[PDB]
Amino acid sequence: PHTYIKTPTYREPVSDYQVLREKAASQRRDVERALTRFMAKTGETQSLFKDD
Amino acid sequence: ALANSVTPAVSVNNEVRTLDNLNPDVRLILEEITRFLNMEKLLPSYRHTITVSCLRAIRVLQKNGHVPSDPALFKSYAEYGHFVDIRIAALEAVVDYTKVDRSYEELQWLLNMIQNDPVPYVRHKILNMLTKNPPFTKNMESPLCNEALVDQLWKLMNSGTSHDWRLRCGAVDLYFTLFGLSRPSCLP
């Protein structure tokens, strides 16, 4: 085959509903955590504990 | 639903609520209500319904031994300026705090807010909530049963609420709930 046979090949597609739900959920949770920590650090802040 | 799951914490020797004794269950709840309240500060909902629910849940966590019993957050949300819904949720939390912690200065804060607030519906609602969840009843011996409080509430019935006809009936209801139909007992 190597002498004259060519087939294109693609990357492995992840079409799984479980891991797609997990990826979208974790990315949404991480971006909202990053956003709220950035907005609490660059403004007036409150805390339940002391100097927390 | 997150606020309904909160059971009273197992404080040992009145240990100060600090990070070490934070329940592993309540840390997830507290992270979620912090995320929800902060996201409401940037993308607000309808009726600030999530602000009202998160203030109610923080008061639930404070009613058990999880968050320190501090009314400063609710006092900042009750400052003339948060949704009238935010305002009445925060004032409900302050009324519950001054019932449980027997706070004198919070009761004077609430009575001052009854006397001079711009919105009269909020004044009527503060008198209503302080009637429904009173800081003391007539049967209770409390530290807040001075002659000074009897004189303040009699001055609030007599003068002070003379301009509304609904604040005066609310002050009559509050005096009835606190001191009853006879002479205030805690008096010379």
UniProtKB/Swiss-Prot annotation, chain A:
Disease per UniProt entry: Neurodevelopmental disorder with severe motor impairment, absent language, cerebral hypomyelination, and brain atrophy: An autosomal recessive disorder with onset soon after birth or in early infancy. Affected individuals do not show developmental progress, are unable to sit or walk, do not acquire speech, have poor visual fixation, and show poor overall growth associated with feeding problems. Additional variable features include seizures, spasticity, and joint contractures. Brain imaging shows hypomyelination, thin corpus callosum, and cerebral and cerebellar atrophy.
Purpose of the protein: The TFIID basal transcription factor complex plays a major role in the initiation of RNA polymerase II (Pol II)-dependent transcription. TFIID recognizes and binds promoters with or without a TATA box via its subunit TBP, a TATA-box-binding protein, and promotes assembly of the pre-initiation complex (PIC). The TFIID complex consists of TBP and TBP-associated factors (TAFs), including TAF1, TAF2, TAF3, TAF4, TAF5, TAF6, TAF7, TAF8, TAF9, TAF10, TAF11, TAF12 and TAF13. The TFIID complex structure can be divided into 3 modules TFIID-A, TFIID-B, and TFIID-C.
Domain notes: Ectopic expression of the histone fold domain acts as a dominant-negative mutant resulting in differentiation inhibition.
Taxonomic source organism: Homo sapiens (Human)
Induction pattern: Induced with triglyceride accumulation.
Protein name: Transcription initiation factor TFIID subunit 8
Family per similarity comment: Belongs to the TAF8 family.
Subcellular location(s) of the protein: Nucleus; Cytoplasm
Coiled coil (residue ranges): none
Subunit structure and binding partners: Component of the TFIID basal transcription factor complex, composed of TATA-box-binding protein TBP, and a number of TBP-associated factors (TAFs), including TAF1, TAF2, TAF3, TAF4, TAF5, TAF6, TAF7, TAF8, TAF9, TAF10, TAF11, TAF12 and TAF13. Interacts with TBP, TAF1, TAF6, TAF10, TAF11 and TAF13. Component also of a small TAF complex (SMAT) containing TAF8, TAF10 and SUPT7L. Forms a heterodimer with TAF10. Interaction with TAF10 is mediated mainly via its histone fold domain while interaction with SUPT7L is via its C-terminal region.
Note: 'Taube nuss' means 'empty nut' in German.
UniProtKB/Swiss-Prot annotation, chain B:
Subcellular location as annotated: Nucleus
Expression by tissue: Expressed in all tissues tested.
Domain of life: Eukaryota
Stated family: Belongs to the TAF2 family.
Pathological association: Neurodevelopmental disorder with feeding difficulties, thin corpus callosum, and foot deformity: An autosomal recessive disorder characterized by impaired intellectual development, microcephaly, delayed psychomotor development, pyramidal signs, thin corpus callosum, and foot deformity.
Subunit organization: Component of the TFIID basal transcription factor complex, composed of TATA-box-binding protein TBP, and a number of TBP-associated factors (TAFs), including TAF1, TAF2, TAF3, TAF4, TAF5, TAF6, TAF7, TAF8, TAF9, TAF10, TAF11, TAF12 and TAF13. Interacts with TAF2C1. Component of the TFTC-HAT complex.
Protein name (database record): Transcription initiation factor TFIID subunit 2
Residues of the full protein shown: 801 to 988 of 1199
